[PDB]
Design a protein around this nucleic acid. Structure first.
Lengths: 256, 256
RNA sequence: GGGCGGGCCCGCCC
RNA sequence: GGGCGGGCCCGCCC
């Protein structure tokens, strides 16, 4: 397994990095690309499918797959993806139940996994039964402590590292194809905020840095970097970031 | 070291009385030095059992409620507490088993069959530990019996002591009077049992035509009107998929 | 001791 | 789509 890790300045930029990477692979392989792309939350998984569809609906079949997909539909698109020699399966850390897919070229990871163990489980889906394979972990600056934890804990090193700053061209291409409304982007980012908040201690993250960055994804996606997430003073209490400067950095109070 | 027995009652509901009587006896004989685990199929039913057992033995013993929908903090504490207690009854579902090794447990009671054939073993493991003696009592009803035959054929276990049980009018009144729950709650409770039992029919070779009406009849029995059926909407009956079924007519009273 | 919310997943049934 | 049971991680209040 040829493991690599693409670091970006902002969490959001991991999205672009991934889209670009996919475009390159499709061009080189003439649309003979079959990859699994993992995501931290269900809402963010669906969000990724939209983008990937708007980008590569024509070239590849984009498959959404997570816990909140009904069992019938889950059984059918596992069978389908087993058959497909081309397509991208976007999913969360779903159970291995019957997740043995042949001829998978790459496993992509946008953002760290919920728990340290899953990193191993994810890359297992490629380079099996003799075939070659690659893994690409797209993270941001503030997620880095995860890689260190992979070594100290599970004793795994990622040989190839690389920085990434997105072109103004790619940012516009992606964001333009985003049809979701602000209320949906908020739901999406909040699910990320909660996910990342849950794995701070485990990955020795810096709360004061990581949360604001994740939240900033809201503005970045709505093409207004300095626009913060609108919430009620009550909702903020419900998150427990009410009297916190981190909260003032992440959110815009609107209780009037 | 495990003295296994099984008390068969005519109706599911009667297993409740059988258990309460059993517990009273053990308390009398042991002068309240009784420590037992009593397993239950659903959460709501577990809580319902705690109410009864509290009204019956709050003075003599500590009654502890323990299931998946108990918050992790409260779960850590009452595990510690029960480990320490030399007297008390833990009412729970097939929870855990993350460190569920409780010392000096005298009996494991089981009201109704377990969800999985395997769990029967797991449950009785909690007694007769590290040399000490222990006993198991399985309270079931006529229609659950196929479970015992399945235990032999599959798991190759035989329960030596059997006993048929028909409750006195005295005990029925003692228990039911202490029940503070309202009819809407008794409906919620029985429905959880209806669904639990419906999920383990094929596995235990139960007769749907017999077992479900019996479980549902628990509603009347508890409200002291044996022929009173469970009130539900034609919509709710469709949600369960027992709409055009005679079994549904036997279990429910339609109010569309 | 009591109350409440959030992220991910698994098993079984209709 | 719904139901029953369960696992892991996180936050808040008294």
């Amino acid at each position: 397994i040829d493991q690599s890790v693409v670091i970006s300045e902002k969490f959001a930029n991991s999205i672009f990095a991934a889209v670009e990477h996919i475009k390159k692979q499709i061009k080189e392989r003439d649309s003979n690309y079959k990859a699994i792309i993992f995501a931290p939350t269900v809402k963010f998984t669906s969000f990724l499918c939209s983008i990937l569809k708007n980008e590569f609906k024509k070239d590849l079949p984009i498959l959404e797959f997570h816990g909140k997909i009904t069992q019938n539909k889950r059984t059918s698109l596992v069978k389908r993806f087993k058959k497909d020699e081309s397509g991208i399966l976007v999913c969360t850390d779903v159970g291995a139940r019957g997740m043995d897919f042949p001829n998978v070229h790459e496993v992509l990871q946008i953002g760290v996994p919920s728990e340290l163990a899953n990193y191993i489980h994810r890359i297992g889906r490629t380079a099996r039964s003799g075939k070659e394979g690659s893994s690409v972990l797209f993270i941001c600056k503030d997620e880095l402590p995860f890689v260190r934890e992979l070594e100290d804990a599970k004793n795994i090193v990622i040989a190839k590292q690389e920085k990434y700053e997105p072109s103004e061209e790619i940012k516009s291409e992606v964001l333009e194809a985003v049809t979701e409304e602000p209320e949906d982007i908020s739901d999406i980012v909040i699910s990320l905020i909660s996910s990342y908040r849950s794995c701070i201690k485990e990955y020795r993250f810096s709360e004061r840095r990581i949360l604001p960055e994740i939240a900033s994804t809201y503005g970045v996606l709505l093409n207004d970097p300095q626009l913060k997430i609108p919430v009620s003073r009550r909702f903020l209490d419900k998150l427990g970031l009410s009297r916190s400067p981190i909260g003032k950095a992440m959110f815009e109070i609107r209780d009037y």
